């Protein structure tokens, strides 16, 4: 997350997980990122497209978060690290990132946890707010409309 943009990783495209293998258990017994183990240091760029759990990366710019009031959007009140966000692809972008948007009612945060992924799951209460069932506390997101 940054004042200008939100970096995301594509986990699924049209009810289809990408990649098919996320690389769980590849790096050992702890909690390790896709390329946080020994395998990432010894990957053959010459013979393969990408590493085990490598995902298509995407960007949701602050302008492309909302349809209106695009000039003064606070991305910190829209997304949090670990959030699962339903987005639409604007452009192919470059080799590193697709450019995505959440500027629609069905687009935005579909999953979130309190305390930035540390707490329990929150549910969407209002267009710009979720809340935690056990704490009662409310957190500000850009919620995609369920149903």
């Amino acid at each position: 997350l940054s004042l200008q943009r939100a970096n995301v990783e594509i986990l699924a495209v049209e009810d289809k997980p990408s990649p098919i293998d996320s690389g769980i258990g590849s790096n050992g017994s702890g909690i390790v990122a896709a390329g946080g183990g020994s395998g990432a240091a010894t990957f053959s760029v010459s013979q393969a497209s990408s590493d085990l759990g490598e995902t298509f990366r995407g960007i949701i710019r602050s302008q492309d978060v909302r349809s209106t009031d695009r000039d003064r959007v606070k991305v910190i009140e829209c997304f949090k690290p670990g959030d699962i966000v339903r987005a639409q692809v604007l452009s192919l972008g470059d080799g590193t990132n697709y450019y995505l948007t959440t500027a629609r009612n069905d687009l935005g945060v579909v999953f979130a946890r309190a305390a930035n992924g540390a707490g329990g799951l929150m549910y969407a209460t209002d267009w710009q707010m979720m809340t935690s069932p056990v704490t009662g506390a409310t957190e500000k997101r850009k919620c995609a409309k369920p149903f």
Partner: protein, 314 residues
């Protein structure tokens, strides 16, 4: 009503998927708590001694096994070599095999942490379970004496020392979860099928060479052959429970389906012998509290699983 396929739900919220399934008394792998995956075995199909009548000359595989559990396939092949030696139940008198585990996932390149640790742990567990005595790897060298004058015949006993060295190549297709157990069991059956080729000989030294057809049984301690089990301990979160129109924990057997592998951090793994003794035990309390009860149920299930895996064939 927005909906995610079980696959992409396992990708998006593994914890939620696991909890939700457990609220119905099932698992994201569509088995209940203590239900193992069935296993199927094709033993000694890749070995050169596969057919006694027509022994494959080109083949160098001493032992073979093809295991299938759920949708995961494991192919284990035992090859061999000879080392020139130099100069009780204690660990000093025992040996091990040197396995290379190749878990088929998308990447190509050097070994992952998974492959390396599985290989090493296979080696170490073979060593400590004391399945393979060093004595059994000793070669009794016959000698090739010349027929009269004009060709050659070999004589074996019914002068340096030598030892057999066993190598294992283990490939894993369609991995869906932790695969160490499958690798271990497959390697066990494979080791049971190994036949050691007979060997003979002619600052200067002559090479030792293996006989083409003759072979003696790799005598392993069947008493000490164990089988592998793994278990997860899950703590039930009250909010993620389905309606199915105060804290609980459940024990889970034979982990799979990513949701379980990603969510569960409290794990138990056992190498258990049919006799009743245990060859290996690993407890990792990364998540839920591991209570004695869980340990005992785990040992019980490991032993019935062991009896099962040892009896189901022959």
């Amino acid at each position: 009503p927005i909906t995610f396929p079980p696959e992409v739900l396992a990708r998006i919220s593994p914890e939620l998927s696991l909890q939700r399934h457990l609220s119905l008394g099932i698992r994201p792998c569509l088995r209940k708590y203590e239900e193992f995956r069935d296993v199927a075995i094709e033993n000694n199909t890749l070995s050169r001694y596969a057919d006694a009548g027509n022994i494959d000359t080109k083949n160098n595989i001493l032992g073979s096994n093809v295991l299938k559990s759920g949708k995961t396939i494991v192919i284990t092949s035992i090859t061999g070599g000879i080392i020139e030696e130099t100069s009780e139940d204690i660990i000093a008198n025992y040996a091990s095999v040197y396995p290379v585990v190749e878990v088929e996932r998308g990447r190509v390149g050097a070994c992952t942490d998974e492959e390396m640790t599985i290989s090493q742990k296979l080696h170490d567990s073979i060593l400590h379970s004391r399945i393979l005595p060093k004595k059994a790897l000793k070669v009794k060298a016959g000698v090739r004496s010349a027929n009269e004058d004009g060709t050659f015949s070999v004589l074996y006993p019914d002068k340096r020392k030598w030892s057999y060295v066993l190598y294992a190549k283990i490939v894993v297709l369609s991995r869906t979860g932790p695969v160490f157990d499958l690798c271990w069991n497959s390697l066990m059956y494979a080791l049971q099928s190994v036949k050691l080729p007979r060997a003979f000989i002619d600052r200067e030294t002559y090479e030792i060479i293996c006989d083409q057809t003759k072979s003696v049984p790799l005598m392993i301690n069947a008493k000490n052959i164990a089988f592998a089990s793994n278990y997860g301990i899950v703590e039930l979160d009250p909010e993620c429970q389905l309606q199915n129109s105060k804290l609980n924990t459940v024990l889970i057997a034979d982990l799979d389906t990513e949701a379980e592998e990603t969510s569960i951090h409290s794990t138990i793994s056992i190498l258990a012998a049919p006799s009743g003794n245990y060859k290996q035990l690993t407890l990792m309390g990364g998540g839920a509290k591991i209570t004695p009860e869980m340990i005992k149920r785990s040992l019980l299930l490991s032993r019935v699983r062991a009896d099962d895996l040892s009896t189901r064939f022959n």
